[PDB]
């Protein structure tokens, strides 16, 4: 009984952990791309502000 319960539970736990990680990946990927876009724009605004001030 012990092993049937344990292996069922590990399967469920790991399935849950796998799906959680999966959700965390998505979320971090969106965060990544929001930051990536911000970085490119910020850098560009610094250049233009520096240039226009001349």
């Amino acid at each position: 009984e012990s092993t049937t319960s344990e292996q069922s539970a590990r399967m469920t736990a790991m399935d849950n952990a796998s799906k959680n990680a999966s959700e965390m990946i998505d979320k971090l990927t969106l965060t990544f791309n929001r930051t990536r876009q911000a970085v490119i724009t910020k850098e560009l605004i610094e250049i233009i502000s520096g240039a226009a001030a001349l």
């Binding site: 850098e43 560009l44 250049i47 233009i48």
Partner: protein
């Protein structure tokens, strides 16, 4: 006369603003009184923006600037072979003038669509990983890309070294003249490089075009095009050339300096809107010519440095997009012991099989597939206690094929030696060999087949493929050798 001569209005930061020169053409080479050259990049209503080929100290307000009937061309021909020159083709190796009998403009249009034919002929690097899984054909543009210090220059150097086996041979079709363009590197680095090629006896068929870190920006800007024209001499006269641009990140930085200082508008990462155009016109000049045009070719291996693996930064984006494929190198692979540090999952050659000999095509296809199957399961290796027999095998085969893609520096391989090594792996012979021993097995195995089995290697090369006979020979060499190895 302000039609044929001008007067420096202002000078600083490698830009001379010149009054007059009413009749200058755009991009014309002009000359300052001191003898320094400059190129006319900005033609404006009241001034010419002239980019300075040297030190500003020698140009002062009011200096006379002349048109001379100058044309931005370079020496071209076999007389450049074995020589180290600067961006304008001047000898910098201290071995006297180039004996050049012909010249060619650095700025010329790439062959159009019609004069070309499909890329077909192998351009053999001698590097197992490349020739098998990222194969390059004559006329292709294949990018070498990765962070600093990941092995990029070495890919190119080993490719140049490899050609000796053909250039020494008797088949003129298979011969390949090499051009290494150094942009923005330090002089002693270039010096180590040519010493390497000299020692390898590769210099005799190599031209080194070098515009190093203290050369002025316009010179670094021209150097790739200069080397490119020297390569086109071979392309256009029924011969084959390979050019390495090491590297294009540095060339683009040099051009950005000029563009920003001319006050041309800045865009992403402060590059101008023509930096894509900069690289695209250079890389389209690599071509495979049809028979009516002599059947020659120019293959290009541009180099790009990424920053922290950012393949989506501006200049890598441009050059990835322009090229026919990419060989991606990675730091973590390097320190893991995967050297060459080629990411075999990401690396691509869109020319692909069309650029491979039958023998390689066979085993490389099997290896590609088994490495992909391995990659799917790879993360379950060091966390796999109770895996089924099937998945246990995919890992076993994967780790062994991966070990066989490792290669020492400065020792490029004949294609038949490559296939014989890959055979041992794809046919399962090493599946029970402890992975740490593979590189040792290969080195000894290869030494043995080269020594005792030249005839076998001959047949793998000649027959195009691996016959029933070659297959029976290898089976018996490998199994007997292996049992001796593990004895």
């Amino acid at each position: 006369d302000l039609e044929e001569t001008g007067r420096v209005l202002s000078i600083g930061d490698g830009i001379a603003r010149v009054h007059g020169l009413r009749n200058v053409q755009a991009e014309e080479m002009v000359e300052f009184s001191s003898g320094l050259k400059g190129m006319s990049l900005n033609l404006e209503p009241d001034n010419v923006g002239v980019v300075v080929f040297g030190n500003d100290k020698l140009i002062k307000e009011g200096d006379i600037v002349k048109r001379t009937g100058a044309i931005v061309d370079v020496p071209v021909g076999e007389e450049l072979l074995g020589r180290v020159v600067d961006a304008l083709g001047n000898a910098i190796d201290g071995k006297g003038p180039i004996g050049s009998k012909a010249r060619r403009r650095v700025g010329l249009k790439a062959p159009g669509i019609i004069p070309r034919i499909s890329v077909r002929e192998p351009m053999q690097t001698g590097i197992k990983a490349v020739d098998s899984l990222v194969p390059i054909g004559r006329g292709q543009r294949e990018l070498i890309i990765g962070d600093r210090q990941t092995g990029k220059t070495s890919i190119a150097i080993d490719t140049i070294i490899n050609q000796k086996r053909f250039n020494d041979g008797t088949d003129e079709k298979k011969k390949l003249y090499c051009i290494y363009v150094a942009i923005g590197q330090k002089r002693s680095t270039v010096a180590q490089l040519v010493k390497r090629l000299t020692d390898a006896d590769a210099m005799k068929y190599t031209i080194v075009v070098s515009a190093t870190a203290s050369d002025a920006a316009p010179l670094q800007y021209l150097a790739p095009y200069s080397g490119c024209s020297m390569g086109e001499y071979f392309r256009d006269n029924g011969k084959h050339a390979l050019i390495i641009y090491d590297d294009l990140s540095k060339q683009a930085v040099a051009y950005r300096q000029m563009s920003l200082l001319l006050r041309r508008p800045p865009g992403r990462e402060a590059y101008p809107g023509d930096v894509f155009y900069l690289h695209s016109r250079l890389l389209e000049r690599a071509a495979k010519m049809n028979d009516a045009f002599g059947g020659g070719s120019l293959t290009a291996l541009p180099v790009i440095e990424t920053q922290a693996g950012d393949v989506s930064a501006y200049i890598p984006t441009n050059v990835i997009s322009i090229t026919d494929g990419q060989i991606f190198l990675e730091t973590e692979l390097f320190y893991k012991g995967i050297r060459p540090a080629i990411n075999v999952g990401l690396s691509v050659s869109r020319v692909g099989s069309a650029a491979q000999t039958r023998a390689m095509k066979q085993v490389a296809g099997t290896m590609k597939l088994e490495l992909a199957q391995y990659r799917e399961v790879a993360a379950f290796a060091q966390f796999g206690s109770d895996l089924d027999a099937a998945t246990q095998q995919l890992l076993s085969r994967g780790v062994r094929l991966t070990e066989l893609l490792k290669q020492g520096q400065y020792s490029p391989m004949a294609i038949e030696e490559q296939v014989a090594v890959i055979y041992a792996g794809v046919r399962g012979y090493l599946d029970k060999l402890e992975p740490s021993k593979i590189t040792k097995f290969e080195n000894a195995f290869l030494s043995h087949v080269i020594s005792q089995h030249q005839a076998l290697l001959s047949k793998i090369r000649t027959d195009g493929k691996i016959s029933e006979e070659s297959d029976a020979k290898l089976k018996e060499i490998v199994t007997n050798f292996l049992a001796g190895f593990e004895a």
